[PDB]
Amino acid sequence: WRKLTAYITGSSNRAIKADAVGKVPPTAILEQLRTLAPSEHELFHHITTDF
Amino acid sequence: GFNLKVKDLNGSARGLTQAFAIGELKNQLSVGALQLPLQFTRTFSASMTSELLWEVGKGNIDPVMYARLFFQYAQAGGALSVDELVNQFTEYHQSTACNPEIWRKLTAYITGSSNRAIKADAVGKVPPTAILEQLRTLAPSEHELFHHITTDFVCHVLSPLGFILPDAAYVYRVGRTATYPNFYALVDCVRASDLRRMLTALSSVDSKMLQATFKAKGALAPALISQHLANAATTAFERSRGNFDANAVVSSVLTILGRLWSPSTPKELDPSARLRNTNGIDQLRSNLALFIAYQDMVKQRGRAEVIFSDEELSSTIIPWFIEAMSEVSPFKLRPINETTSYIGQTSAIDHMGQPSHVVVYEDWQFAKEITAFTPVKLANNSNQRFLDVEPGISDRMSATLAPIGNTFAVSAFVKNRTAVYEAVSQRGTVNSNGAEMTLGFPSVVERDYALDRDPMVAIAALRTGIVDESLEARASNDLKRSMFNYYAAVMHYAVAHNPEVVVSEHQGVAAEQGSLYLVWNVRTELRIPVGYNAIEGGSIRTPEPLEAIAYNKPIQPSEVLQAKVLDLANHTTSIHIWPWHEASTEFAYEDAYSVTIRNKRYTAEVKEFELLGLGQRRERVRILKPTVAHAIIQMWYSWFVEDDRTLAAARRTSRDDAEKLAIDGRRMQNAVTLLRKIEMIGTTGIGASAVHLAQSRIVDQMAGRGLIDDSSDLHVGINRHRIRIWAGLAVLQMMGLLSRSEAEALTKVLGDSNALGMVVA
Amino acid sequence: WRKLTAYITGSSNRAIKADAVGKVPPTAILEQLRTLAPSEHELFHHITTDF
Amino acid sequence: SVDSKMLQATFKAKGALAPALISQHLANAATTAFERSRGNFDANAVVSSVL
Numbered sequence: 086w087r088k089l090t091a092y093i094t095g096s097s098n099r100a101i102k103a104d105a106v107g108k109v110p111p112t113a114i115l116e117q118l119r120t121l122a123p124s125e126h127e128l129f130h131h132i133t134t135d136f
Numbered sequence: 137g138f139n140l141k142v143k144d145l146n147g148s149a150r151g152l153t154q155a156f157a158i159g160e161l162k163n164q165l166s167v168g169a170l171q172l173p174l175q176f177t178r179t180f181s182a183s184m185t186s187e188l189l190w191e192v193g194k195g196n197i198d199p200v201m202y203a204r205l206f207f208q209y210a211q212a213g214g215a216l217s218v219d220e221l222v223n224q225f226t227e228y229h230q231s232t233a234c235n236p237e238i239w240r241k242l243t244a245y246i247t248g249s250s251n252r253a254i255k256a257d258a259v260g261k262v263p264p265t266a267i268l269e270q271l272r273t274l275a276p277s278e279h280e281l282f283h284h285i286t287t288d289f290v291c292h293v294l295s296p297l298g299f300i301l302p303d304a305a306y307v308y309r310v311g312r313t314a315t316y317p318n319f320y321a322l323v324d325c326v327r328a329s330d331l332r333r334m335l336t337a338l339s340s341v342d343s344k345m346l347q348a349t350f351k352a353k354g355a356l357a358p359a360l361i362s363q364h365l366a367n368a369a370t371t372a373f374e375r376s377r378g379n380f381d382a383n384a385v386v387s388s389v390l391t392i393l394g395r396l397w398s399p400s401t402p403k404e405l406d407p408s409a410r411l412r413n414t415n416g417i418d419q420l421r422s423n424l425a426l427f428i429a430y431q432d433m434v435k436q437r438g439r440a441e442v443i444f445s446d447e448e449l450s451s452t453i454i455p456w457f458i459e460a461m462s463e464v465s466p467f468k469l470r471p472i473n474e475t476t477s478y479i480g481q482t483s484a485i486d487h488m489g490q491p492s493h494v495v496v497y498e499d500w501q502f503a504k505e506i507t508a509f510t511p512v513k514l515a516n517n518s519n520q521r522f523l524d525v526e527p528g529i530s531d532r533m534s535a536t537l538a539p540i541g542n543t544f545a546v547s548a549f550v551k552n553r554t555a556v557y558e559a560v561s562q563r564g565t566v567n568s569n570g571a572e573m574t575l576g577f578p579s580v581v582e583r584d585y586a587l588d589r590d591p592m593v594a595i596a597a598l599r600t601g602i603v604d605e606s607l608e609a610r611a612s613n614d615l616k617r618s619m620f621n622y623y624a625a626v627m628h629y630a631v632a633h634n635p636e637v638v639v640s641e642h643q644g645v646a647a648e649q650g651s652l653y654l655v656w657n658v659r660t661e662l663r664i665p666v667g668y669n670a671i672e673g674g675s676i677r678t679p680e681p682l683e684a685i686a687y688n689k690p691i692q693p694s695e696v697l698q699a700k701v702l703d704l705a706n707h708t709t710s711i712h713i714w715p716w717h718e719a720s721t722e723f724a725y726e727d728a729y730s731v732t733i734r735n736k737r738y739t740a741e742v743k744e745f746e747l748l749g750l751g752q753r754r755e756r757v758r759i760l761k762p763t764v765a766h767a768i769i770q771m772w773y774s775w776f777v778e779d780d781r782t783l784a785a786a787r788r789t790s791r792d793d794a795e796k797l798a799i800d801g802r803r804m805q806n807a808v809t810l811l812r813k814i815e816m817i818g819t820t821g822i823g824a825s826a827v828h829l830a831q832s833r834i835v836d837q838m839a840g841r842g843l844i845d846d847s848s849d850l851h852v853g854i855n856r857h858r859i860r861i862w863a864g865l866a867v868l869q870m871m872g873l874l875s876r877s878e879a880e881a882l883t884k885v886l887g888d889s890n891a892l893g894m895v896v897a
Numbered sequence: 898w899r900k901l902t903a904y905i906t907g908s909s910n911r912a913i914k915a916d917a918v919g920k921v922p923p924t925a926i927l928e929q930l931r932t933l934a935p936s937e938h939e940l941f942h943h944i945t946t947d948f
Numbered sequence: 949s950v951d952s953k954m955l956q957a958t959f960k961a962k963g964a965l966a967p968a969l970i971s972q973h974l975a976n977a978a979t980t981a982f983e984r985s986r987g988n989f990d991a992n993a994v995v996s997s998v999l
Contacts, residue, residue, distance in 0.1 A: 086971040098967035100249020101260030105964040136952065248967065262963050266972075301957065487911065514980065555917065560910040751989035797904030805921050891925055
């Protein structure tokens with residue numbers, strides 16, 4: 086997640102309530118995650134997608 | 137409970153007595169006579185039924201809990217004195233106080249936006265815990281919960297800003313306990329009251345309270361407040377030390393008071409000049425509970441010296457540190473009469489008309505509450521556990537559990553236990569010794585096996601008297617301690633029924649007194665022999681003790697002694713409870729039923745989950761254990777078990793028919809009744825679950841294999857019952873209860889009569 | 898006879914009161930009583946018991 | 949469904965959430981998601997059993 090969080094905002098881990106302001110994914114992270122490669126077979130990605 | 141032949145304990149339970157209590161040891165032992173009367177109204181006892189599940193951690197300060205909870209470590213002897221408890225705190229805290237750093241690091245956590253401008257932004261916040269767990273990481277609550285100390289402490293400062301939210305919300309299960317505390321207990325409870333005073337003091341304030349270094353629009357420069365706080369804590373340190381040493385004082389007081397019960401201590405001319413300061417004195421005394429400590433000193437302090445120097449006259453102020461004036465402990469001012477009453481008396485007689493195989497018992501009440509929960513490790517072995525209810529399921533079971541309690545009519549057990557015991561003067565008329573009087577007190581017993589604990593050879597050591605020590609001292613103390621209560625409870629009754637005494641002591645000793653102590657004034661039962669303790673011609677008063685409690689007409693109780701129900705479940709398992717690993721056991725038991733069908737033996741093995749009827753779920757349930765009943769049954773059980781010995785013996789000692797014959801039924805019927813229970817408890821769901829399961833599996837074994845000529849084989853009693861019973865007993869075995877071994881002795885009931893099982897149902 | 902009885906229920910000399918006297922299927926007992934009896938044909942004897 | 953749906957407040961406006969932190973909740977939130985594991989019993993036998 087933390088890595089992802091870097092993606093969640095490149096504004097990443099600093100304060101306050103992580104700014105407590107702003108967002109939006111819209112996917113894309115997914116494809117990052119594809120990169121990292123964890124859906125040993127795919128669509129475990131989906132599992133993560135909705136989740 | 138405990139049986140005694142009433143003529144001695146001066147050779148048979150100097151593991152008991154006031155003299156003994158003096159540690160004045162060995163003698164039938166006089167009471168000269170000699171003085172002045174008493175009673176109370178009250179008790180102040182803990183809370184006889186106490187044992188509670190306390191929701192634990194949260195908000196701002198409930199000092200009471202905190203301390204009271206503290207009191208639990210202290211109590212836990214796992215924390216000795218309060219002093220020990222405190223040094224730690226300071227040790228972390230001062231270790232804390234001296235560094236603004238600690239905070240600073242935290243501040244990095246407070247916002248990762250950390251130390252830069254302006255009033256640290258002067259905008260935004262929110263914790264909600266979590267920091268805590270960081271702090272756990274850093275590791276400063278040398279033992280925990282110094283963490284709590286820090287928990288409430290920072291948060292408030294935060295407040296206004298951030299937002300909290302934790303799993304401070306907890307429950308701690310405080311368990312089974314005494315009623316009567318004891319000396320240091322007092323003292324430390326008072327130190328805990330000091331701790332209340334602390335608690336109101338350190339805790340509370342030192343940061344509450346306030347600057348302005350928050351004030352909107354601003355917030356606070358970062359690093360800076362740390363300095364305030366760190367030092368703010370220094371002040372929190374500096375106030376240090378509650379009342380004076382309670383120990384001496386209380387004792388001082390006690391003896392002071394001691395010095396009041398008198399005779400005859402005209403030192404000052406008794407409570408006197410010092411008395412004249414007083415006018416609050418008044419109540420102290422007036423509860424029996426209050427006395428009770430004294431004795432403790434007598435042994436403890438060997439019976440100390442010089443009324444504790446009065447704490448040098450501390451005018452009117454140290455009682456005002458008490459719990460009645462610093463309410464630390466459950467100690468419950470409770471009216472003597474109600475102090476207990478689940479006990480009624482019961483008795484024998486040979487047509488005597490007096491009794492001599494006599495039972496006064498305590499009556500419980502026990503019923504449902506059953507819970508099989510999966511402890512949830514929601515963390516890596518952390519106290520942070522939800523204990524997850526497998527709802528309905530246990531509960532399906534609970535209902536089957538339900539018929540039982542009632543059916544197991546324990547109150548009647550004891551009724552029975554007498555009813556049985558004696559037969560007429562058959563075995564009599566055969567007494568002029570210490571007649572039996574038997575005391576039906578599950579409670580301790582319950583407690584000990586509920587405490588795992590197996591004192592009973594030490595209890596026996598009490599039995600002889602001389603009760604002594606060589607191992608796990610903690611336990612030993614406990615072992616001892618527990619004992620105290622007993623007599624303690626007793627007098628209540630003693631008093632209850634005869635609430636009249638004169639306090640008189642034994643000389644022949646140093647420090648110089650021997651407990652003004654008590655006597656009662658029985659005369660109830662008439663011309664009666666029972667030890668040198670009397671007779672008291674015509675008229676009767678009488679000094680000591682048990683017997684007197686024998687000396688009434690038996691009765692029922694009026695206290696239920698219903699077991700308490702507990703929670704860390706509803707609402708609370710969203711949050712945890714701490715240690716209970718023990719408090720639960722993993723679910724299970726599997727065994728196999730063997731029967732020989734047309735001369736070929738068949739055997740099928742069976743298991744729990746499915747015994748519920750449920751393949752074969754998660755497998756991760758620990759179960760709230762059966763604290764009560766396992767024991768109560770082991771009473772029941774045991775009660776049964778001795779009896780056969782006696783009974784067999786009784787037959788042996790029967791050397792005519794009539795007696796033997798009397799034994800017969802007396803022997804018999806009732807067993808099958810046991811059986812009546814057991815098959816009956818087969819008529820339940822759960823019995824049936826076995827049964828259904830059972831036959832079927834068999835059925836195939838013959839039919840499925842060959843010969844099918846057999847349903848019948850289920851349907852003669854013998855076997856039927858056999859399985860049923862066995863099964864029924866089996867249930868118990870996953871109810872823990874028995875041992876297969878122990879059942880086996882019940883199986884020894886098989887030889888007998890060998891009648892058995894004609895007809896049903 | 899009495900004697901026999903006397904035990905059968907139930908142990909005699911105080912013998913009084915609402916107790917709990919779960920007498921039984923008496924069944925066997927009788928045969929003791931038979932023993933004490935003589936043993937004439939079948940049982941009449943038993944009836945009598947029932948009586 | 950669930951294991952994160954479902955919920956804290958570590959979002960609640962004006963706030964949002966400290967960064968890294970929620971991860972811990974979630975990661976572990978997933979652990980619970982793990983722990984429940986195993987549906988009905990083995991269908992195979994059973995169905996056949998039934999059959």
